[PDB]
Amino acid sequence: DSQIQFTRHASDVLLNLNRLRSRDILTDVVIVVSREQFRAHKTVLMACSGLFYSIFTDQLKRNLSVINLDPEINPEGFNILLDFMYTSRLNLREGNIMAVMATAMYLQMEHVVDTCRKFIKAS
Amino acid sequence: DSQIQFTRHASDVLLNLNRLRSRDILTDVVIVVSREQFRAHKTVLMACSGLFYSIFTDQLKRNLSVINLDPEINPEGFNILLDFMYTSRLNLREGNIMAVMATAMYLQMEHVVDTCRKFIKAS
Numbered sequence: 386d387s388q389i390q391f392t393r394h395a396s397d398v399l400l401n402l403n404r405l406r407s408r409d410i411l412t413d414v415v416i417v418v419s420r421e422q423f424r425a426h427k428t429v430l431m432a433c434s435g436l437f438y439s440i441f442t443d444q445l446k447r448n449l450s451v452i453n454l455d456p457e458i459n460p461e462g463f464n465i466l467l468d469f470m471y472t473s474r475l476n477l478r479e480g481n482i483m484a485v486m487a488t489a490m491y492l493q494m495e496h497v498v499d500t501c502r503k504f505i506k507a508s
Numbered sequence: 509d510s511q512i513q514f515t516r517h518a519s520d521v522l523l524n525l526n527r528l529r530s531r532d533i534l535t536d537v538v539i540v541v542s543r544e545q546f547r548a549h550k551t552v553l554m555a556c557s558g559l560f561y562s563i564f565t566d567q568l569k570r571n572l573s574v575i576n577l578d579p580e581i582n583p584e585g586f587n588i589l590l591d592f593m594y595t596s597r598l599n600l601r602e603g604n605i606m607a608v609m610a611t612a613m614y615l616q617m618e619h620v621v622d623t624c625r626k627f628i629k630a631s
C-alpha cells in the first residue's frame with residue numbers, strides 16, 4: 386500500500402518462529418508420522434498446509450494437541466516439508482523427490498506440488 | 509543455502525497469520541492498552557518485539573493470557589506496531605511519528621525505532 390515496507394520483516398519473523406520451534410517455545414501440537422513425532426505451532430501449519438488449515442479451522446479439532454497422520458506418510462518427506470514451512474527452503478533431491486511430492490499432495494501444499502512437477506521435468 | 513528458495517513464502521505465511529488474527533483463530537493473548545484490548549498470537553509478538561520476547565520466553569510468564577501494558581502507552585501507536593508485526597507495513601505520519609517511536613522503544617523494536625529516526629530526519 387502507501388505505508389513503509391520492511392522487505393526483510395516477513396523472513397525475519399519466520400526465522401524467529403523456527404527458533405521458537407527449535408526450543409519448543411509455545412509449540413502446541415505433536416504430529417505423529419509412523420514411528421516419529423514432530424512438534425510445531427498450529428498457526429504455522431495452518432498458514433502453510435491446506436490439510437492442517439482444514440483440520441484446525443474447524444472448532445471440532447481446533448484444540449487437538451496430537452494429530453496422527455496417515456501411516457503411509459514417511460517421516461523423511463514430512464520433515465523436509467515441515468522445515469520448508471519454517472524456512473522457505475525446500476530440500477528436493479533425486480533420492481527424495483517422489484516421497485516429498487506425494488507428501489505435499491497429502492498436506493495440500495499446492496505451490497510445493499507445482500515446484501516438484503518442475504523438478505521431475507528438469508531432471 | 510543449497511535448497512530451493514521460495515521467495516514469497518515468508519510473506520505468504522505472514523499474510524495467513526494476519527488472516528488468523530482477523531478471525532481470532534488460535535490467538536492466545538489479550539494485550540490491554542489503556543481502555544483498549546488487542547488479541548494476538550504470542551509467537552508473533554515474540555518474533556517481533558524484544559519486550560514480548562523477554563516476557564513470554566520466561567517460564568514464569570509463558571502461559572499468561574492477559575498482558576497489561578504500561579498505562580502511558582497510547583492504543584494508536586500500539587495498533588500501528590501490531591499491524592506492522594503482522595504485515596511488514598509501517599504507517600508513519602507526521603501526526604503519529606512521536607507516539608509510534610516512543611511505543612517502539614517500549615516494545616524494544618530496534619529496526620522500527622531506527623526507521624522512525626530516519627523519518628524525523630527526512631521531515
Ligand SMILES: CC(=O)Nc1cc(Nc2cc(NC3CC3)n3ncc(C#N)c3n2)ccc1N1CC[C@@H](N(C)C)C1
Nearest residue numbers: 431432433434435436438439493495524525527528531
Ligand atoms: C482445503 C483448503 O483449505 N483450501 C484453501 C483454503 C483457502 N484459504 C486459507 C488458506 C490458508 N492456508 C493454507 C495453506 C494455504 N489460510 N491460513 C489462514 C487462513 C485464514 N483465514 C487461510 N485461509 C484458500 C484456498 C484454498 N484452496 C482450495 C482450492 C485449492 N487449489 C487446488 C486451487 C486452494
Ligand SMILES: CC(=O)Nc1cc(Nc2cc(NC3CC3)n3ncc(C#N)c3n2)ccc1N1CC[C@@H](N(C)C)C1
Nearest residue numbers: 401402404405408554555556557558559561562616618
Ligand atoms: C531484550 C531481548 O530479548 N533482546 C534480544 C533478543 C535476542 N534474541 C531473540 C529475539 C527474538 N525476537 C525479538 C524481536 C527480536 N526471538 N524470537 C525468537 C527467538 C528465539 N529463540 C528470539 N531470540 C537477540 C538480541 C536481542 N537484543 C539485545 C540487545 C538488543 N539491541 C539493542 C542491540 C537486541
